Coordinates of C-alpha atoms in Angstrom, one line a residue:
Chain A
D90 CA 11.9 -38.5 -11.2
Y91 CA 14.4 -36.0 -9.9
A92 CA 13.3 -33.4 -12.5
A93 CA 9.6 -33.9 -11.7
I94 CA 10.1 -33.6 -7.9
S95 CA 12.2 -30.5 -8.4
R96 CA 9.5 -29.0 -10.6
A97 CA 7.2 -29.8 -7.7
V98 CA 9.6 -28.0 -5.3
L99 CA 9.5 -24.9 -7.5
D100 CA 5.7 -25.1 -7.9
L101 CA 5.3 -25.2 -4.1
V102 CA 7.7 -22.3 -3.6
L103 CA 6.1 -20.2 -6.3
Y104 CA 2.8 -20.9 -4.6
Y105 CA 4.2 -19.7 -1.3
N106 CA 5.5 -16.5 -3.0
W107 CA 8.8 -16.4 -1.3
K108 CA 11.2 -13.7 -2.6
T109 CA 14.4 -15.0 -0.9
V110 CA 15.0 -18.7 -0.2
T111 CA 18.2 -20.4 1.0
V112 CA 18.6 -23.9 -0.3
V113 CA 20.7 -26.5 1.5
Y114 CA 21.8 -29.9 0.0
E115 CA 24.1 -32.6 1.4
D116 CA 25.3 -34.4 -1.8
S117 CA 25.2 -34.2 -5.7
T118 CA 21.7 -35.9 -5.6
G119 CA 20.8 -32.7 -3.8
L120 CA 22.0 -30.3 -6.5
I121 CA 20.2 -32.4 -9.1
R122 CA 16.9 -32.3 -7.1
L123 CA 17.4 -28.5 -6.7
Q124 CA 18.2 -28.1 -10.4
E125 CA 15.0 -26.4 -11.6
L126 CA 14.8 -24.4 -8.4
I127 CA 18.4 -23.0 -8.8
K128 CA 17.8 -22.2 -12.5
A129 CA 14.4 -20.5 -11.7
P130 CA 15.8 -17.1 -10.5
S131 CA 16.4 -16.5 -14.2
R132 CA 12.6 -16.7 -15.2
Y133 CA 11.0 -15.8 -11.8
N134 CA 11.2 -12.8 -9.4
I135 CA 12.9 -15.0 -6.8
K136 CA 16.4 -14.9 -5.4
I137 CA 18.4 -17.8 -4.0
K138 CA 21.3 -18.4 -1.7
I139 CA 22.7 -21.9 -1.8
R140 CA 24.7 -23.6 1.0
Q141 CA 25.8 -27.1 1.8
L142 CA 25.8 -28.8 5.2
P143 CA 29.2 -30.1 6.3
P144 CA 30.0 -33.7 5.3
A145 CA 31.9 -35.3 8.2
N146 CA 31.3 -33.2 11.3
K147 CA 27.5 -33.6 11.4
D148 CA 27.1 -30.7 13.8
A149 CA 26.1 -28.0 11.3
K150 CA 25.8 -25.4 14.0
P151 CA 28.3 -23.0 12.3
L152 CA 26.2 -23.3 9.2
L153 CA 23.0 -22.6 11.1
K154 CA 24.7 -19.7 13.0
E155 CA 25.8 -18.1 9.7
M156 CA 22.3 -18.7 8.3
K157 CA 20.7 -17.1 11.3
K158 CA 23.2 -14.2 11.3
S159 CA 22.5 -13.3 7.6
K160 CA 18.7 -13.5 8.3
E161 CA 17.5 -16.3 6.1
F162 CA 14.0 -17.4 7.2
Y163 CA 12.8 -19.4 4.1
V164 CA 15.0 -22.5 4.1
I165 CA 14.9 -25.5 1.8
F166 CA 16.7 -28.6 2.9
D167 CA 17.6 -31.5 0.6
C168 CA 18.5 -34.3 3.1
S169 CA 17.8 -37.9 3.8
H170 CA 15.5 -38.5 6.8
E171 CA 18.3 -39.4 9.2
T172 CA 20.2 -36.2 8.6
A173 CA 16.9 -34.4 8.4
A174 CA 16.1 -35.5 12.0
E175 CA 19.6 -34.6 13.1
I176 CA 19.4 -31.2 11.5
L177 CA 16.0 -30.7 13.1
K178 CA 17.6 -31.3 16.5
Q179 CA 20.3 -28.9 15.5
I180 CA 17.9 -26.3 14.3
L181 CA 16.0 -26.6 17.6
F182 CA 19.1 -26.2 19.6
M183 CA 20.0 -23.0 17.7
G184 CA 16.6 -21.6 18.7
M185 CA 15.6 -21.1 15.0
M186 CA 12.3 -23.0 15.4
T187 CA 10.1 -19.8 15.6
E188 CA 7.2 -18.5 13.6
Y189 CA 9.7 -16.4 11.6
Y190 CA 11.4 -19.4 10.0
Chain B
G45 CA -3.3 -30.0 -1.5
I46 CA -1.6 -32.3 -4.0
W47 CA 0.9 -32.0 -6.8
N48 CA 0.3 -34.1 -9.9
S49 CA 3.0 -34.4 -12.4
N50 CA 1.3 -33.4 -15.7
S51 CA -1.3 -31.4 -13.9
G52 CA 0.2 -29.2 -11.2
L53 CA -0.9 -28.0 -7.8
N54 CA -4.4 -28.4 -6.2
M55 CA -3.3 -26.6 -3.0
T56 CA -6.8 -25.3 -1.9
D57 CA -7.4 -28.1 0.5
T58 CA -33.2 -4.1 -10.7
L59 CA -29.9 -2.2 -10.5
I60 CA -29.3 0.2 -7.6
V61 CA -27.9 3.5 -8.7
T62 CA -26.3 5.7 -6.0
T63 CA -26.2 9.4 -6.7
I64 CA -26.0 12.9 -5.2
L65 CA -28.0 16.1 -5.6
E66 CA -25.8 18.5 -7.6
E67 CA -27.1 21.1 -10.1
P68 CA -27.7 20.5 -13.0
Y69 CA -26.6 16.9 -12.9
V70 CA -29.1 15.6 -10.3
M71 CA -32.0 17.6 -9.1
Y72 CA -35.5 17.1 -7.6
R73 CA -38.0 17.6 -10.4
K74 CA -40.6 20.3 -9.7
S75 CA -44.2 19.4 -10.4
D76 CA -47.7 20.4 -9.6
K77 CA -48.6 16.7 -9.4
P78 CA -47.1 14.0 -7.1
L79 CA -43.9 12.3 -8.2
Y80 CA -42.8 8.9 -7.0
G81 CA -39.6 6.9 -7.4
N82 CA -37.0 7.9 -10.0
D83 CA -39.5 10.4 -11.3
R84 CA -38.6 12.6 -8.4
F85 CA -35.3 13.3 -10.1
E86 CA -34.2 15.1 -13.3
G87 CA -31.0 16.6 -14.7
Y88 CA -28.0 15.7 -16.9
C89 CA -27.1 12.6 -15.0
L90 CA -30.6 11.3 -15.1
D91 CA -30.9 11.7 -18.9
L92 CA -27.6 9.8 -19.1
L93 CA -28.8 7.0 -16.9
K94 CA -32.0 6.7 -19.0
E95 CA -29.8 6.5 -22.1
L96 CA -27.6 3.9 -20.5
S97 CA -30.5 1.7 -19.5
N98 CA -32.0 1.8 -23.0
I99 CA -28.6 0.9 -24.6
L100 CA -27.7 -1.8 -22.0
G101 CA -31.3 -2.7 -21.3
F102 CA -31.6 -2.6 -17.5
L103 CA -33.9 -1.4 -14.9
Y104 CA -32.8 0.8 -12.0
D105 CA -33.7 2.4 -8.6
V106 CA -32.1 5.8 -7.9
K107 CA -31.0 6.3 -4.3
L108 CA -29.2 9.3 -3.0
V109 CA -26.0 8.5 -1.1
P110 CA -27.1 8.6 2.6
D111 CA -24.2 10.7 3.9
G112 CA -24.4 13.1 1.0
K113 CA -20.7 12.9 0.3
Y114 CA -18.9 12.1 -2.9
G115 CA -16.3 10.1 -1.1
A116 CA -13.0 10.6 0.6
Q117 CA -10.7 8.3 2.6
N118 CA -10.5 9.2 6.3
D119 CA -7.2 9.3 8.3
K120 CA -7.6 5.6 9.2
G121 CA -8.1 4.4 5.6
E122 CA -11.9 4.3 5.5
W123 CA -14.1 5.6 2.7
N124 CA -17.5 7.3 2.7
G125 CA -19.9 8.9 0.2
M126 CA -20.8 7.2 -3.0
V127 CA -17.4 5.4 -3.2
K128 CA -18.1 3.5 0.0
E129 CA -21.6 2.5 -1.2
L130 CA -20.0 0.9 -4.3
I131 CA -17.3 -0.7 -2.2
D132 CA -19.8 -2.3 0.2
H133 CA -21.9 -3.5 -2.8
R134 CA -24.7 -1.3 -1.6
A135 CA -25.1 0.0 -5.1
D136 CA -24.5 -1.3 -8.6
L137 CA -23.8 2.0 -10.3
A138 CA -22.8 5.5 -9.2
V139 CA -24.1 7.8 -11.9
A140 CA -23.3 11.4 -10.9
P141 CA -20.6 14.0 -11.5
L142 CA -18.1 11.7 -9.9
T143 CA -14.5 12.5 -10.6
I144 CA -12.2 9.7 -11.8
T145 CA -9.1 9.8 -9.6
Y146 CA -6.0 7.6 -9.0
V147 CA -6.9 7.0 -5.3
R148 CA -10.4 6.0 -6.1
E149 CA -9.4 3.6 -8.9
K150 CA -7.7 1.5 -6.3
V151 CA -11.1 0.7 -4.7
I152 CA -13.7 1.0 -7.5
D153 CA -13.8 0.9 -11.3
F154 CA -14.7 3.9 -13.5
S155 CA -16.2 3.9 -17.0
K156 CA -14.4 6.2 -19.5
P157 CA -15.2 9.8 -18.9
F158 CA -18.6 11.1 -20.2
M159 CA -17.5 14.7 -19.4
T160 CA -14.2 16.5 -18.8
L161 CA -13.4 19.3 -16.4
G162 CA -10.7 20.7 -14.1
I163 CA -10.5 22.3 -10.7
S164 CA -10.7 26.1 -11.0
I165 CA -11.9 29.1 -8.9
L166 CA -15.4 30.4 -8.5
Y167 CA -15.3 34.0 -7.2
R168 CA -17.0 37.4 -7.9
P169 CA -21.3 58.0 -13.7
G170 CA -23.0 61.4 -13.6
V171 CA -22.5 64.6 -11.6
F172 CA -21.9 62.7 -8.4
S173 CA -18.6 61.2 -9.7
Chain C
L175 CA -7.2 63.0 -10.2
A176 CA -4.1 61.2 -11.5
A177 CA -3.5 59.5 -8.2
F178 CA -7.1 58.3 -8.2
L179 CA -6.9 57.0 -11.8
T180 CA -3.4 55.4 -11.7
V181 CA -4.3 53.3 -8.6
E182 CA -7.8 52.4 -9.8
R183 CA -6.3 51.4 -13.2
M184 CA -3.0 49.6 -12.4
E185 CA -4.7 46.9 -10.3
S186 CA -5.2 32.9 -9.8
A187 CA -4.7 30.4 -7.0
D188 CA -1.5 32.2 -6.3
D189 CA -3.3 35.5 -5.7
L190 CA -5.5 33.6 -3.2
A191 CA -2.6 31.7 -1.7
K192 CA -0.3 34.6 -1.0
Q193 CA -3.0 36.5 1.0
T194 CA -5.5 35.9 3.9
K195 CA -8.4 38.4 3.7
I196 CA -10.3 36.4 1.1
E197 CA -11.4 33.0 2.6
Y198 CA -11.3 30.1 0.2
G199 CA -12.2 26.4 0.3
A200 CA -13.8 23.4 -1.2
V201 CA -16.6 20.8 -0.6
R202 CA -15.8 18.5 2.3
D203 CA -14.8 15.0 1.3
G204 CA -14.8 15.6 -2.5
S205 CA -12.1 15.1 -5.0
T206 CA -11.2 18.8 -4.9
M207 CA -10.6 18.8 -1.2
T208 CA -8.5 15.6 -1.6
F209 CA -6.5 17.2 -4.4
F210 CA -5.3 20.0 -2.1
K211 CA -4.9 17.6 0.9
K212 CA -2.5 15.4 -1.2
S213 CA -0.8 18.1 -3.3
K214 CA 2.9 18.2 -3.0
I215 CA 3.1 21.5 -4.9
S216 CA 4.0 24.4 -2.6
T217 CA 1.2 26.9 -3.4
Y218 CA -1.6 24.2 -3.3
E219 CA 0.1 22.8 -0.2
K220 CA 0.1 26.4 1.3
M221 CA -3.6 26.6 0.4
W222 CA -4.5 23.2 1.9
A223 CA -2.8 24.5 5.1
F224 CA -5.1 27.5 5.0
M225 CA -8.4 25.8 4.3
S226 CA -7.6 22.9 6.7
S227 CA -6.8 25.2 9.6
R228 CA -9.9 27.1 9.0
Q229 CA -11.3 23.7 8.2
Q230 CA -14.7 23.9 9.9
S231 CA -15.1 27.1 8.0
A232 CA -13.1 27.0 4.8
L233 CA -14.6 23.7 3.7
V234 CA -18.3 23.6 2.8
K235 CA -20.8 20.8 3.1
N236 CA -21.8 20.9 -0.6
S237 CA -21.6 23.1 -3.6
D238 CA -24.8 25.0 -3.0
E239 CA -23.5 26.1 0.4
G240 CA -20.2 27.0 -1.2
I241 CA -21.9 29.1 -3.9
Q242 CA -24.0 30.8 -1.2
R243 CA -20.8 31.5 0.7
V244 CA -19.3 33.1 -2.4
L245 CA -22.5 35.3 -2.8
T246 CA -22.9 36.4 0.8
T247 CA -19.2 36.5 1.9
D248 CA -15.7 37.5 0.7
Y249 CA -15.0 33.8 -0.2
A250 CA -13.6 32.0 -3.2
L251 CA -14.9 28.5 -4.0
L252 CA -12.5 25.9 -5.4
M253 CA -15.0 24.2 -7.7
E254 CA -14.8 22.1 -10.8
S255 CA -15.0 24.0 -14.2
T256 CA -18.2 22.7 -15.7
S257 CA -20.0 23.4 -12.4
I258 CA -18.5 26.9 -12.5
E259 CA -19.7 27.2 -16.1
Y260 CA -23.2 26.5 -14.9
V261 CA -23.1 29.1 -12.1
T262 CA -21.4 32.0 -13.8
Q263 CA -23.8 31.4 -16.7
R264 CA -26.6 32.4 -14.3
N265 CA -25.1 35.1 -12.2
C266 CA -23.1 37.7 -14.1
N267 CA -21.5 38.9 -10.9
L268 CA -19.7 35.6 -10.5
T269 CA -16.7 34.5 -12.5
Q270 CA -14.0 31.8 -12.9
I271 CA -10.6 32.9 -11.7
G272 CA -7.6 31.7 -13.6
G273 CA -7.5 28.5 -15.7
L274 CA -7.9 24.9 -14.8
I275 CA -5.6 23.7 -12.0
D276 CA -5.7 20.1 -13.3
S277 CA -7.4 18.1 -16.1
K278 CA -9.8 15.2 -15.5
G279 CA -13.2 13.7 -16.1
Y280 CA -16.4 12.3 -14.6
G281 CA -17.2 8.7 -15.0
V282 CA -19.8 6.1 -13.9
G283 CA -18.5 4.3 -10.9
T284 CA -19.0 0.5 -10.3
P285 CA -17.8 -1.9 -7.8
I286 CA -14.4 -3.4 -8.6
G287 CA -14.7 -6.1 -11.3
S288 CA -18.3 -5.2 -12.3
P289 CA -19.3 -6.6 -15.8
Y290 CA -21.2 -3.4 -16.4
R291 CA -18.2 -1.1 -16.4
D292 CA -16.9 -1.9 -19.9
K293 CA -20.4 -2.0 -21.3
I294 CA -21.1 1.4 -19.8
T295 CA -17.9 2.7 -21.4
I296 CA -19.1 1.3 -24.8
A297 CA -22.5 3.0 -24.3
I298 CA -20.9 6.3 -23.3
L299 CA -18.8 6.1 -26.5
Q300 CA -21.9 5.5 -28.5
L301 CA -23.8 8.5 -27.1
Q302 CA -20.6 10.5 -27.7
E303 CA -20.4 9.3 -31.3
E304 CA -24.0 10.1 -32.1
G305 CA -23.6 13.6 -30.5
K306 CA -26.0 13.0 -27.6
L307 CA -23.5 14.0 -24.9
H308 CA -23.2 17.4 -26.5
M309 CA -26.9 17.8 -26.7
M310 CA -27.4 16.7 -23.1
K311 CA -24.7 19.2 -22.0
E312 CA -26.4 22.0 -24.0
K313 CA -29.9 21.0 -22.7
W314 CA -28.9 21.4 -19.0
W315 CA -26.3 24.1 -19.1
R316 CA -28.3 25.8 -21.8
Chain D
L269 CA 2.7 66.2 -6.5
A270 CA 1.1 63.3 -8.4
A271 CA 4.3 61.3 -7.8
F272 CA 3.8 61.8 -4.1
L273 CA -0.1 61.4 -4.1
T274 CA -0.1 58.1 -6.1
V275 CA 2.5 56.7 -3.7
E276 CA 0.3 57.7 -0.7
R277 CA -2.5 55.5 -2.1
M278 CA -0.4 52.3 -1.9
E279 CA -0.6 51.7 1.9
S280 CA -5.5 41.7 7.7
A281 CA -3.1 39.0 9.0
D282 CA -1.8 38.8 5.5
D283 CA -0.8 42.5 5.5
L284 CA 1.1 41.9 8.7
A285 CA 2.5 38.6 7.4
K286 CA 4.0 39.9 4.2
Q287 CA 5.9 42.6 5.9
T288 CA 8.4 43.2 8.8
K289 CA 8.3 46.8 10.0
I290 CA 5.3 46.3 12.2
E291 CA 6.0 43.8 15.1
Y292 CA 3.2 41.5 16.0
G293 CA 2.6 38.8 18.6
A294 CA 0.4 37.2 21.2
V295 CA 0.3 36.4 24.9
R296 CA 2.9 33.7 26.0
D297 CA 1.4 30.3 26.6
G298 CA -2.2 31.2 25.7
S299 CA -4.5 29.5 23.1
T300 CA -3.7 32.2 20.6
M301 CA 0.1 31.6 20.7
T302 CA -0.6 27.8 20.5
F303 CA -2.9 28.4 17.4
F304 CA -0.1 30.0 15.5
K305 CA 2.5 27.5 16.8
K306 CA 0.4 24.6 15.5
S307 CA -1.2 26.2 12.4
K308 CA -0.4 24.4 9.1
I309 CA -1.7 27.3 7.1
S310 CA 1.1 29.1 5.2
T311 CA 0.4 32.7 6.3
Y312 CA -0.1 31.8 10.0
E313 CA 2.8 29.5 9.8
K314 CA 4.8 32.4 8.3
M315 CA 3.6 34.6 11.2
Chain E
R20 CA 0.8 -14.1 35.8
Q21 CA 0.5 -17.4 37.6
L22 CA 1.7 -20.9 36.5
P23 CA -1.0 -23.6 36.6
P24 CA -0.4 -25.6 39.8
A25 CA 0.6 -29.2 39.0
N26 CA -1.4 -30.0 35.8
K27 CA 1.8 -28.4 34.2
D28 CA -0.3 -27.3 31.2
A29 CA 2.0 -24.3 31.3
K30 CA 1.9 -24.3 27.4
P31 CA -1.3 -22.1 27.4
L32 CA 0.3 -19.5 29.7
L33 CA 3.5 -19.5 27.6
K34 CA 1.3 -19.1 24.4
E35 CA -0.5 -16.1 25.9
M36 CA 2.8 -14.5 26.8
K37 CA 4.1 -15.2 23.2
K38 CA 1.0 -13.7 21.6
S39 CA 1.0 -10.7 23.9
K40 CA 4.6 -10.1 22.8
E41 CA 6.0 -10.1 26.3
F42 CA 9.7 -10.8 26.0
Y43 CA 11.4 -9.9 29.4
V44 CA 10.0 -12.5 31.8
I45 CA 10.9 -13.0 35.4
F46 CA 10.2 -16.5 36.7
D47 CA 9.9 -17.5 40.4
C48 CA 9.6 -21.2 41.2
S49 CA 11.8 -24.1 42.5
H50 CA 14.4 -25.9 40.4
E51 CA 12.2 -28.8 39.2
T52 CA 9.4 -26.5 38.2
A53 CA 11.9 -24.2 36.5
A54 CA 13.3 -27.1 34.4
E55 CA 9.8 -28.2 33.4
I56 CA 9.0 -24.6 32.4
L57 CA 12.3 -24.3 30.3
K58 CA 11.6 -27.5 28.4
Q59 CA 8.0 -26.2 27.7
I60 CA 9.5 -22.8 26.5
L61 CA 11.9 -24.6 24.1
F62 CA 8.9 -26.6 22.8
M63 CA 6.7 -23.5 22.4
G64 CA 9.6 -21.9 20.5
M65 CA 10.2 -19.0 22.8
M66 CA 14.0 -19.7 23.3
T67 CA 15.4 -17.1 20.9
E68 CA 17.6 -14.0 21.0
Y69 CA 14.6 -11.8 21.7
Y70 CA 13.5 -13.3 25.0
Chain F
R169 CA 21.4 -21.1 -16.7
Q170 CA 21.5 -24.2 -18.9
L171 CA 21.9 -24.7 -22.6
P172 CA 19.2 -26.5 -24.5
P173 CA 19.7 -30.3 -24.5
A174 CA 20.2 -31.3 -28.1
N175 CA 19.1 -28.4 -30.3
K176 CA 22.1 -26.3 -29.3
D177 CA 21.0 -23.3 -31.3
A178 CA 21.0 -21.4 -28.0
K179 CA 20.1 -18.2 -29.7
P180 CA 17.1 -17.9 -27.3
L181 CA 19.4 -18.3 -24.2
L182 CA 21.9 -15.8 -25.7
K183 CA 19.1 -13.3 -26.3
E184 CA 17.8 -13.6 -22.7
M185 CA 21.4 -13.1 -21.4
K186 CA 21.8 -10.0 -23.6
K187 CA 18.4 -8.6 -22.3
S188 CA 19.4 -9.2 -18.6
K189 CA 22.7 -7.3 -19.2
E190 CA 24.9 -10.2 -18.0
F191 CA 28.5 -9.6 -19.1
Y192 CA 30.8 -12.0 -17.2
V193 CA 29.8 -15.6 -17.9
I194 CA 31.2 -19.1 -17.1
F195 CA 30.5 -21.3 -20.1
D196 CA 30.7 -24.9 -19.1
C197 CA 30.4 -27.5 -21.9
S198 CA 32.3 -29.8 -24.1
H199 CA 34.6 -28.1 -26.6
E200 CA 32.7 -29.5 -29.6
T201 CA 29.6 -27.6 -28.5
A202 CA 31.6 -24.6 -27.1
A203 CA 32.6 -24.0 -30.7
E204 CA 29.0 -23.9 -31.7
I205 CA 28.2 -21.6 -28.8
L206 CA 31.0 -19.2 -29.9
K207 CA 29.7 -19.3 -33.4
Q208 CA 26.3 -18.2 -32.2
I209 CA 28.0 -15.6 -30.1
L210 CA 29.6 -14.1 -33.2
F211 CA 26.3 -14.4 -34.9
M212 CA 24.3 -12.7 -32.1
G213 CA 26.7 -9.7 -32.0
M214 CA 27.8 -10.6 -28.5
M215 CA 31.5 -11.2 -29.4
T216 CA 32.0 -7.6 -28.4
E217 CA 34.5 -5.6 -26.3
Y218 CA 31.8 -5.7 -23.5
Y219 CA 31.6 -9.3 -22.5
Chain G
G225 CA -9.7 42.2 9.6
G226 CA -12.2 39.7 10.8
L227 CA -12.0 36.7 13.1
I228 CA -9.2 34.2 12.2
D229 CA -11.1 31.4 13.8
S230 CA -14.4 30.7 15.8
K231 CA -14.6 29.4 19.3
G232 CA -15.7 29.9 22.9
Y233 CA -14.8 30.3 26.5
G234 CA -15.9 27.6 28.9
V235 CA -15.5 26.6 32.6
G236 CA -12.7 24.1 32.9
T237 CA -12.8 21.1 35.3
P238 CA -10.6 18.2 36.0
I239 CA -11.3 15.3 33.6
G240 CA -14.4 13.4 34.7
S241 CA -15.7 16.0 37.1
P242 CA -19.4 15.6 38.1
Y243 CA -19.6 19.4 38.1
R244 CA -19.0 19.9 34.4
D245 CA -22.4 18.9 33.0
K246 CA -24.1 20.7 35.9
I247 CA -22.2 23.8 35.0
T248 CA -23.2 23.4 31.4
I249 CA -26.9 23.1 32.5
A250 CA -26.4 26.2 34.6
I251 CA -24.8 28.2 31.8
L252 CA -27.7 27.2 29.6
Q253 CA -30.2 28.5 32.2
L254 CA -28.4 31.9 32.5
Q255 CA -28.3 32.1 28.7
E256 CA -32.1 31.2 28.6
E257 CA -33.1 33.9 31.1
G258 CA -30.9 36.4 29.3
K259 CA -28.4 36.9 32.1
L260 CA -25.3 36.2 30.0
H261 CA -26.3 39.1 27.7
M262 CA -26.9 41.4 30.7
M263 CA -23.6 40.4 32.2
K264 CA -21.8 41.1 29.0
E265 CA -23.4 44.5 28.7
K266 CA -22.7 45.3 32.3
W267 CA -18.9 44.8 31.9
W268 CA -18.3 45.8 28.3
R269 CA -20.9 48.6 28.8

């Protein structure tokens, strides 16, 4: 279930005790799977920025550049595995595969 | 770990009493006959400890804090005195005129006060006149 | 005669603080020393400066050494009030200057999270209730 | 007379510190000068 | 520091440099060795705006 | 936030909102439950000059 | 008044000098045989 797996996402993030997490989807399935997490700030001491990777031009390097510029280290991606591998290539090329992120 | 749906996350995979010589709380008992163990000490704090062991029913061994200090935190964050002894589990209880302070409560627990006090200052005719 | 009498008739931590002839200090690594070391109040901060500069001298190893320093020297000991009560009670030349600088208490220490702590509190409360803490105080301070 | 005599019965580092008429000092670049320069004690700090 | 000769296990040297927090690094080698070292640096994660 | 699913007596949600001092809201619902939400707003004293 | 602090005079040497401990031993000797006292008295008279 989307609701159950999003409760799982929230439980893992509340285990990791992040205080600022930037979530990233690609499609409406992504907002639904991030539903509980996006509502959470209301009941939990966590803050959330929310972005969306660009639909057609698959090079999300401006998105990663803005995310790197505004210092967002705790990132949650809601992707399929193909665009997850492509965004892993793009996050390696931006040099954001450090021990800070 | 693991995340089960209706369960959640499983992500993981007798008594030694330290004290200090301070009059009239803790003192070496004076006797014409040889004194061994706890019997070597007397004073307010020892009467209190006897009372506590009768009420809570426990045995105990009185040991003076080795560095003879109550306990302060050095410039590098390290503690000494009786406070350090409790921290390092080298003692179960510290029964002495030990002041309950904010800084100390961060590293050890205190019972409710058995005596109150405050910091103050100890200082000092005829024809011929 | 008037000049003799008027002078010899007209004459706290402040009095100690705003001067330097009288040495003053506290027991090394005790809560009193820590109080002055961490105090943000000007006068106490001024005093910590004094006793920490003359550190090796202003601070004493223990109360007995501090009391002896008060007896044999022009020295004022920053000591806790019930300890002072015990001393002045036995040497009429000694006295407590001013009032209490702060208010606090003595408690039994235990390692963090010890099951004995609350039980000891309950026990202390009992002894207090049955008036034994009073009796114990009177027995030793006499 | 008493008004003068009582006044002439009103006169340590503190005595030097809490006043300004009497100048006081130490040898330049010696341990004494350094002592006062680095002292955290109020009166010596004042001096 | 010295690169390992031809085993190319340069990853331990790069790891030591990363742990010791040594950002400004001057390399001296031939073009092929330099390319291998750069790929290894990207893999180690030391291709950032600090280095 | 989100309204409760069927029991639209969102008095708890409105309370939480009042406690957090949240003044500018974007209600998003059908009109037949927006009427009920406005009724609970008038009931909860939040139909005020503030919000 | 009295002394503001308590300290002493010593022979200085560069850091790690072999002579330092030897000088300390020598000072201790002169002290022992009462020559430091005599020297003080000779000059302060």
